[PDB]
Amino acid sequence: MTWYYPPDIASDLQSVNLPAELKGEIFACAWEYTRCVIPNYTNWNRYVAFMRTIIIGVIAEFRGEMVDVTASTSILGYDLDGVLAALFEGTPGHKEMAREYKTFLLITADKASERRDGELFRRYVNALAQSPRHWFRMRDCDALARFTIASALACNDLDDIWYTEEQFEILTEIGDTLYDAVAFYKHRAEGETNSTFAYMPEDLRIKAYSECREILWALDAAWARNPKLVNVINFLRFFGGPIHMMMRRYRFVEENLTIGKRNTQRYKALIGRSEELMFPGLAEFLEVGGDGVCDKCRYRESYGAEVSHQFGGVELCSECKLSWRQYLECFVERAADVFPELKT
Amino acid sequence: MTWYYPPDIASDLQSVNLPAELKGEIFACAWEYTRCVIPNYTNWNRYVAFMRTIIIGVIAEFRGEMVDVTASTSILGYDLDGVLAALFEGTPGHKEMAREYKTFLLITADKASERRDGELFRRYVNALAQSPRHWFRMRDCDALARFTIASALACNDLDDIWYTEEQFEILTEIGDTLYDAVAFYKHRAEGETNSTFAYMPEDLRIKAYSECREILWALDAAWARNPKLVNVINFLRFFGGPIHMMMRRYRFVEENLTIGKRNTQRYKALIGRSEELMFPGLAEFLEVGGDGVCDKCRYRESYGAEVSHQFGGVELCSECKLSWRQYLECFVERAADVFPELKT
Ligand SMILES: [Zn+2]
Ligand SMILES: [Zn+2]
């Protein structure tokens, strides 16, 4: 197995205790991901800064104990704030994107470690299920979807382009619905907490892909001859399933070129650091939703024990399933309301 | 069904006898294809010129009688030489890319019409099977692979970038092998003449995808921080299977988000117009290979009668299968010989 990546990152992770062959595979993963979801760039330095955010994120998912965003010490030989500044300085969402990424590192590492049985992760998983709109916002951060939209703009020196909160909500809902519709079978086999059709109706998965893809084509056509905005469309289009064919980390080849088959002290200290570590509104999502808002849904005391061939989070009750069904079934009108260019 | 495409092409095909709903679908097809395989552009006018070459090509595949490149009259309300000049003027391969495209229109229309039982198509199909290297060169033109590499450079105002013949041969072999490995089952059901694994061994299809994809990653890494060359890589990567998920013309949604389940007078007149209508070397390919070079392979008197659930071209004999196997099995070394950056 031979790993391909630019030499700029070949001497990263100095004194990180992983074998050289594993660092090679991580660097390859970062480069492949970056080339797939930000396929164009003008700013090599920002591109490499993005690659390093993906390096850290891959290790956080693999061995959560290795990545502690709560500690002031270097992350994996990097200066996290420095890397984020190299990526985002002079761009409209720098401060919010640092919060987005640190949230992703906090939750991801907690999940890929012994902290998975902890109170932060327990409240996170409960808060995912409090409403379909909360789900899409939290899934966004978990997938770095708006982070990567922001990164795609930054990496093309588009330092003036930005979206409202509601616009990001719809753009990431498109990207995340597309990805999660395709990642469905993998996610179910692995006992995933963060998979859209663990919550949304299975009998609308195919239609959801089809509608998200069509609205993405309609947006693309409505943004024609502003080639700035193609970096946003391209992200959603290549992220939204196609990465399963392009990245060696997925199993397209292995499946024969087929697709388809209570101590609350740390938690309170982290809520206290919400402006630093949590995306805007997450502290309220965790405080309001962390114990489970609905008396009929099935919560668990902990989400650490890893289940298989079923989703590992909250099980929605009948009434919640219907509300989530109804939210999915008005996707087009929710999209058209924030992107009125779709009305025509 | 709603069609999305830029308004620049909305009034194309004036006085072309197709219903408005079908023109809409063609315009959508052209826009979707263009956005998928040339996902970045700087030159809107060249981008629209490319879209129009795809408009003409889609109609040529659908109703070959509607598109005659041999006649001096307008093609479908366009001036073909004008569109090609808008796309390619000032670029290194303008003259050769006009020949590439006119070949594609000649063969495609012949195939999608009554001329499919004709001597040109009979000699074309025989010439496909004369050697594996001939196959990849002819498949390239049939897929507009080097045409689209050239177009991807042009559409990004990269007017100085070019490849040797041998480099184009390997780049298109990568793109065409990737696409044909994925399009395998569709191609077989339709009785396709132009499908790589109708000729190359079925038992190497999975490995061929895997090796082409890896060499494409190795090239990508070897071309790092020359962001010019990402337009070439991106073409091959998105063309090489991912379009099956992104373009509404494919059936990803319809399959539930799954992948995997003798009058020689005209012929002699066209050989006489080879500098105009045929890519460099095709006239020799047709003259030398048109009657079938191997006495053991199975040729047909005509390839017009359309077969189903099997390939519709030449059936290679034992000895030819082995030579084709051996050519496929030395892909990496053939690639490394023309792109020595891969040696490291
Ligand atoms: Zn409930
Ligand atoms: Zn033979």
Q: Of B205, B150, B193, B246, whose CA–CA distance to B331 is shortest?
A: B205
Helices A94-111 and A119-128 cross at an angle (nearest 10°) of: 110
Residue type, A225: R
What is the number of other CB atoms lying within 10 angstroms of the CB of residue B295?
7
Q: Of B207, B255, B235, whose CA–CA distance to A257 is shortest?
A: B207
Deposited resolution, Å: 2.1
Residue of A nearest to B237 (CA): A246
Q: Of A339, A149, A166, A174, whose CA–CA distance to A231 is shortest?
A: A149
Q: Of B109, B175, B50, whose CA–CA distance to B183 is shortest?
A: B175
What is the number of other CB atoms lying within 10 angstroms of the CB of residue B80?
19
For residue B34, the chain A residues in CB contact (below 8 A) are: none
Q: Of A22, A13, A18, whose CA–CA distance to A3 is shortest?
A: A22
CA distance B338 to B340: 6
From the CA of A323, how far away is ligand 1's center (Å)? 9
Beta-bridge partner residues of B78: B75
Structure tokens at B318: 């034992």
CA distance B82 to A231: 30
Q: Which residues contact A7 (CB under 8 A, 6 or more apart)?
A: B224
Q: Which residue has the tokens 């091959």?
A: B236
Q: Are B299 and B306 in contact (CB under 8 A)?
A: no
For residue A9, the chain B residues in CB contact (below 8 A) are: none
Among 3.40.50, 1.20.120, 1.10.246, 1.10.600, what is the CATH number of B11-342? 1.10.600
From the CA of B197, how far away is ligand 2's center (Å)? 16
Contact B257 A206 (CB under 8 A): yes
Q: Which residues contact A79 (CB under 8 A, 6 or more apart)?
A: none
Q: Is residue A155 a known part of a binding site?
A: no
Q: Is residue A310 exposed (0-12), middle (13-18) or buried (19+ Cβ within 10 Å)?
A: exposed
Rg of chain B over Cα atoms, rounded to whole angstroms, equals 19
Contact B259 A256 (CB under 8 A): no
Q: Are A340 and A320 in contact (CB under 8 A)?
A: no
CA distance B59 to B76: 9
Length of chain B: 344
Contact A257 B209 (CB under 8 A): yes
Q: Of B244, B18, B51, B58, whose CA–CA distance to A221 is shortest?
A: B51
Q: Of A145, A341, A328, A140, whose CA–CA distance to A238 is shortest?
A: A145
Contact A40 B39 (CB under 8 A): yes
Q: Which residues contact A322 (CB under 8 A, 6 or more apart)?
A: none
Q: Which residues contact A168 (CB under 8 A, 6 or more apart)?
A: A140, A146, A149
Q: Are B137 and B169 in contact (CB under 8 A)?
A: yes
Q: Are A135 and A129 in contact (CB under 8 A)?
A: yes
Of B225, B242, B253, the CB nearest to A245: B242
CA distance A85 to A87: 5
Q: Are A99 and A278 in contact (CB under 8 A)?
A: yes
Residue of A nearest to B214 (CA): A248
Contact A4 B257 (CB under 8 A): no
Residue of B nearest to A181 (CA): B257
From the CA of A324, how far away is ligand 1's center (Å)? 10
Q: Of A181, A206, A208, A173, whose CA–CA distance to A339 is shortest?
A: A173
Beta-bridge partner residues of A315: A298
Residue type, A293: V
Half-sphere exposure of A44 (CA within 13 A, CB side): 11
CA distance B121 to B302: 8
What is the number of other CB atoms lying within 10 angstroms of the CB of residue A287?
15
Measured between its terminal Cα atoms, the distance across chain A in Å is 50
Our CA angle for B195, A242, A124, nearest 5°, is 160
CA distance A186 to chain B (A): 13
Structure tokens at A50: 């993005």
Q: Which of the residues A195, A257, A332 would you substitute to probe the B interface, choosing the one with the greatest number of B C-beta atoms within 10 Å?
A: A257
Q: Is residue A212 a known part of a binding site?
A: no
CA distance B41 to chain A (A): 7
Half-sphere exposure of B118 (CA within 13 A, CB side): 19
Q: Which residues contact B292 (CB under 8 A, 6 or more apart)?
A: B126, B129, B130, B299, B314
Any chain B CB within 8 A of the CB of A238? Answer: yes
Helices B145-154 and B94-111 cross at an angle (nearest 10°) of: 140
Q: Are A127 and A188 in contact (CB under 8 A)?
A: no
Which 147-206 residues of chain B touch chain A by CB within 8 A? 181-182, 184, 205-206
CA distance B210 to chain A (A): 6
Residue type, A97: M
Q: Is residue A294 a known part of a binding site?
A: yes
Beta-bridge partner residues of B259: A259
Q: Which of the residues A217, A230, A332, A339 would you substitute to probe the B interface, choosing the one with the greatest number of B C-beta atoms within 10 Å?
A: A217
Q: Are B139 and B327 in contact (CB under 8 A)?
A: no
Q: Which ligand is nearest to the CA of B320?
A: 2
Domain boundaries, chain B: 11-342
Beta-bridge partner residues of B75: B78
From the CA of B309, how far away is ligand 2's center (Å)? 22
Contact A221 B6 (CB under 8 A): yes
CA distance A125 to chain B (A): 27
Any chain A CB within 8 A of the CB of B260? Answer: yes
Could you give the dihedral angle defined by the CA atoms of residues A78, A79, A82 and A87, in that order, rounded to the nearest 10 degrees? 40
CA distance A223 to A178: 20
Which 16-75 residues of chain A touch chain B by CB within 8 A? 28, 31-32, 35-36, 39-42, 44
Q: Which ligand is nearest to the CA of A297?
A: 1
For residue A184, the chain B residues in CB contact (below 8 A) are: 257
Residue B34 DSSP SS3: helix
Q: Is residue B190 a known part of a binding site?
A: yes
Q: What is the widest separation between alpha-carbon atoms in chain A?
A: 56
Residue B163's φ and ψ, nearest 5 degrees, are: -130, 155
Of A32, A214, A253, the CB nearest to B209: A253
3-state DSSP of chain A: CCCCCCHHHCCCCCCCCCCHHHHHHHHHHHHHHHHHHCCCCCCHHHHHHHHHHHHHHHHHHHCHHHCCCCCCCCECCECHHHHHHHHHCCCCCHHHHHHHHHHHHHHHHHHCCHHHHCHHHHHHHHHHCCCHHHHHHHHHHHHCHHHHHHHHHHCCCCCCCCCCHHHHHHHHHHHHHHHHHHHHHHHHHCCCCCCHHHCCCHHHHHHHHHHHHHHHHHHHHHCCCCCCCHHHHHHHHHHCCCHHHHCCCCCCCCCCCCECCCCCHHHHHHHHCHHHHCCCCHHHHHHHHCCCCCCCCECCCCCCCCCCCCCCCCECCHHHHHHHHHHHHCHHHHHHHHCHHHCC
Of B206, B217, B234, the CB nearest to A256: B206
Element (H, E) at B82: helix B80-88
Q: Which residue has the tokens 């005509």?
A: B302
Half-sphere exposure of A319 (CA within 13 A, CB side): 7
Q: Are B87 and B80 in contact (CB under 8 A)?
A: no
Residue type, B255: E
Q: Are B306 and B189 in contact (CB under 8 A)?
A: no
Beta-bridge partner residues of A259: B259
